Ligand binder design. Structure first.
Ligand code: A1AH1
Lengths: 215, 215
């Protein structure tokens, strides 16, 4: 899904430092010194802030520093300011002159206390089952920062199709909410023994499970 | 000063063609064949669609064609589809290891087909009832445009407290999704005959009802 592997999210308080990694393979990150980093504020055009692992373009403050160790490049942002809040991407040229990209890391300069998400997993409703639909819904609410990743598990294996997750939105309590729904057929829901929703936030994971109970 | 000049906006209806420009100088755009184009749906990672002025990466349909003349690069999107509604950025390499990005062009696919919402109401799960929670979720999906008003009913009376509704987010099917959830105590859920979710989209209203059952 993402050639280079970046953490989905990172965070720190104003004035602190935060380090985000960009892990590849021997033929890209560790094989050359062409790792770049890009910063994109929400709704803005991206900006190159690091090239050739460590070089800072003109106008990029020294608070941003890049390095590499093996197959993993790292960007460090010291003296975090609210302006540094943005999405950070890495890229690296490969062996056959192909450019590879990381998935991005959402960096949040905490503007309020951190809050873990409340998760509720709902099994199929009777009405939708009689309409040949067995959609599960994983409700996620009351979390901050608003970065979250969701993973569904049929029995114990990961599902890689039919998952949808809404963009997190601020609610009345100034915390974020979102929902992930898995569009299962009534057969899929009955054939397997249980489905699970896995939610990851600020590095920690929570998992709820549901199973057919003949109702 | 580092800024390629793109048109702020472009629009067109399905099946139409659209061309957007990326004007630089003789040192960046007109000084090499390193012009790239990136597509980005809001709230999502971008995708490189053109590199070296005209090359499409694998997976990019030939509906997207790039060109260059003087210091002005142009991207053309023929046969506009709903999934082409997004932001588009150009970039070009400049001397001094500089990578210049344009301001970005929001392409709007006009007159996309209206679609009524699929409404699925979920009663409290067996787990959250043990945990003394009785939250209901009204999953609303597959509707366009992304405007909906939600109303909740207890039996026949309106519900005025404990209602939250996420902001509709566009999903992979190019239609919107959202979840309205009602926070009830188990006593509220078991003391009423039914709760209803009323979703209104484009003057038309759908209603779903659930009631306490053995489940
Ligand atoms: C070089 C500019 C990039 C940018 C950033 C923000 C908006 C638009 C473009 C940086 C990340 N970037 C990607 C990233 C990913 C994951 N992919 C798959 C790409 O094809 C391209 C291109």
């Amino acid at each position: 899904q993402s050639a280079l592997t970046q953490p989905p999210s990172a965070s720190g308080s104003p004035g602190q430092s935060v380090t985000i990694s960009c892990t590849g393979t021997s033929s890209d990150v560790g094989g050359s010194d062409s790792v770049s980093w890009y910063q994109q504020h929400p709704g803005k055009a991206p900006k190159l802030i690091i090239y050739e692992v460590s070089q800072r373009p003109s106008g990029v403050p020294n608070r941003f520093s890049g390095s590499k160790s093996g197959n993993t490049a790292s960007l460090t942002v010291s003296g975090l300011q609210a302006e540094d809040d943005a999405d950070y991407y890495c890229s690296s040229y490969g062996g056959d002159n192909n450019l590879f990209f990381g998935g991005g890391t959402k960096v949040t300069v905490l503007g309020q206390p951190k809050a873990a998400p409340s998760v509720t997993l709902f099994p199929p409703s009777s009405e939708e089952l009689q309409a040949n639909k067995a959609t599960l819904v994983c409700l996620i609410s009351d979390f901050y920062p608003g970065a979250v990743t969701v993973a569904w598990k049929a029995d114990s294996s990961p599902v890689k199709a039919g998952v949808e997750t809404t963009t997190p939105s601020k609610q009345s309590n100034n915390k974020y909410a979102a929902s992930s729904y898995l569009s299962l057929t009534p057969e899929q829901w009955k054939s397997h023994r249980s489905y699970s929703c896995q939610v990851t936030h600020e590095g920690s994971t929570v998992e709820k499970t549901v199973a057919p109970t003949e109702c």
